């Protein structure tokens, strides 16, 4: 990928990977993650019905005009992997997408994380287990740190992370798992999930004998 | 409105035979022309190859002539078969309308022209797996609601390969959903959980169940959440 990134409000100017020779004929694709494709620009300047007129492509007029997709008023929601399908007179089919100008859109506001915590469910402490689940949403930006307690003491055993990701809302999402035995669990007073974020924390805490 | 919906089957072997499916709505597939695409961890998107009306196909030559392509007009469904898969084969597969342009450059009794497609309506994708080990099917767990709205879920458990997807109440309960992307555990395991935010007043008479599938293992589980029962 080719990374760019734009400022909220600002106009993107996406060149394509690969310059024509001749007559060209460009289609531009948008890829969100968790979604498929979408056409935003056909035979160079094209525009498909439901695409805003935001999103714009160079009309090939017998310049060196370098094939270029211009964004206006950037939007969070425009922040996605962006391809030039690029077709030209002089270099046969082009069976490649070419790579992906991979759009970060920043100045977002902050924005704290939602944090929900539970402990393991009867269900699985009755199948011998227990997962204690931290769920974290809706935070930007998305560098955080989770770290997990036992009582007051920190915690490295049984610990799982994603990686922050962005949401359709274009903020982020993660989540942490705690595995433990049963009788860790019920030995404790009490477990937390700790999410600090732009220099604040959410807490949350479950204790076996709360309900 | 036409609507295109593949189904493959989540995981094959290595040196063993890919098959997808487009089931398409809406519109006969006589009226386009259709091609396949896939999104491999890591790389860009890959063009695998595209079929006209007189049931005619071109291949990249990426594919090295491991795949077919082909419709079935009395399913109205689009075919894709890859055979010899390796893990590189490991993608996200979608069936697109491909809509054929022709760009004069010249006279075209001089052939002084090309062919180009532009991909107009796509599927949403069904991620194929390539790998050795076998599948595995969820465990679910009920993620009991807060006692004192109120956040409840399910815990998708220890699940291969990806993906796994999740509704509420069969289809009928969407607003406050948020199904959280999977971990990825040293076991090489899934995880996911899948949360709802309800009226806290609503618990104990409005039934929460949260439909998990996992199409790799055939694994439906229906699974109620309710209030602790303390």
């Known amino acids: 990928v080719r990374p760019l990134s734009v400022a909220l409000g600002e106009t993107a100017r996406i060149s394509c990977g690969r310059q024509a020779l001749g007559s060209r004929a460009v289609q531009w694709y948008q890829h969100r993650p968790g979604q498929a494709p979408i056409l935003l620009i056909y035979n160079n300047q094209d525009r498909p019905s439901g695409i805003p007129e935001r999103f714009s492509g160079t009309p090939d007029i017998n310049f060196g005009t370098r094939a270029t997709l211009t964004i206006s008023g950037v939007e969070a929601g425009d922040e996605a992997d962006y391809y030039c399908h690029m077709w030209d007179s002089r270099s046969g089919f082009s069976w490649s997408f070419g790579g992906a100008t991979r759009l970060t859109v920043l100045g977002q506001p902050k924005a704290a994380p939602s944090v929900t915590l539970f402990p393991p469910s009867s269900e699985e402490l009755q199948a011998n287990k227990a997962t204690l689940v931290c769920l974290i949403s809706d935070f930007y930006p998305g560098a955080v740190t989770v770290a997990w307690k036992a009582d007051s003491s920190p915690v490295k055993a049984g610990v799982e992370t994603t990686t922050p990701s962005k949401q359709s809302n274009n903020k982020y999402a993660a989540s942490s798992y705690l595995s433990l035995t049963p009788e860790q669990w019920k030995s404790h007073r009490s477990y937390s999930c700790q999410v600090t974020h732009e220099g604040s924390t959410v807490e949350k805490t479950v204790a076996p004998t709360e309900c | 409105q036409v609507q295109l919906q593949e189904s493959g089957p989540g995981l094959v072997k290595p040196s063993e035979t890919l098959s997808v499916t487009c089931s398409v709505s809406?519109?006969?597939?006589?009226?386009?022309?259709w091609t396949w695409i896939r999104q491999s961890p890591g790389k860009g998107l890959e063009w695998i190859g595209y079929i006209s009306d007189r049931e005619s196909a071109t291949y990249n030559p990426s594919l090295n002539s491991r795949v077919v392509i082909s419709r079935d007009t009395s399913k109205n469904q689009l075919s894709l078969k890859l055979n010899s898969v390796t893990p590189a084969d490991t993608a996200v597969y979608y069936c697109?309308?491909?809509?054929?342009?022709?760009?004069?450059?010249?006279?075209?009794?001089?052939?002084?022209?090309?062919?180009?497609?532009?991909?107009?309506?796509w599927g949403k994708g069904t991620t194929v797996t390539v790998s050795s080990a076998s599948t595995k099917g969820p465990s679910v767990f009920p993620l009991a609601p807060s006692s004192k709205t109120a956040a409840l879920g399910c815990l998708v458990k220890d699940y291969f390969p990806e993906p796994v997807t999740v509704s509420w109440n069969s289809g009928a309960l969407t607003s406050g959903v948020h199904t959280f992307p999977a971990v990825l555990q040293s076991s090489g395991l899934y995880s996911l959980s899948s949360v709802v935010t309800v009226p806290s007043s609503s618990l104990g008479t409005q039934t929460y169940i949260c439909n998990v599938n996992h199409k790799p293992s055939n694994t439906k589980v229906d699974k109620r959440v309710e209030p602790k029962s303390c």
């Open positions: 809406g519109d006969s597939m006589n009226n386009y022309y």
């Open positions: 697109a309308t491909a809509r054929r342009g022709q760009r004069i450059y010249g006279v075209v009794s001089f052939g002084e022209f090309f062919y180009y497609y532009s991909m107009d309506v």
